[PDB]
């Protein structure tokens, strides 16, 4: 609506976590979640 926001509101990824054996966090940044019109301007390819 007004105050476009476009930021994480609800966390439904997982319900709970009890035992953690590893943890890593990157540096702060800001990523634009605003919707865009037209063709796909970004491509991300990952190999795991």
């Amino acid at each position: 609506k007004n105050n476009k926001s476009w930021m994480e509101s609800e966390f439904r990824v997982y319900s709970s976590a009890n035992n953690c054996t590893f943890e890593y966090v990157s540096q702060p940044f800001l990523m634009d979640l605003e919707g865009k019109q037209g063709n796909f301007k970004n491509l991300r390819e990952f190999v795991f």
């Binding site: 054996t21 590893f22 943890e23 890593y24």
Partner: protein, 48 residues
């Protein structure tokens, strides 16, 4: 950990898992900041 505000009781001793980091043991063993220090099965120098 060695200077934390509070420690768990002897019966309730906490089990802290340490991983995903580096250990600098030079400042710990060789600082002579503790009354007693001993190792079993391996010398402190080899552990470094």
């Amino acid at each position: 950990v060695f200077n934390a505000t509070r420690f768990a009781s002897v019966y309730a001793w906490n089990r802290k898992r340490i991983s995903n980091c580096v250990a600098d043991y030079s400042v710990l063993y060789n600082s002579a900041s503790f009354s007693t220090f001993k190792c079993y099965g391996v010398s402190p120098t080899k552990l470094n």
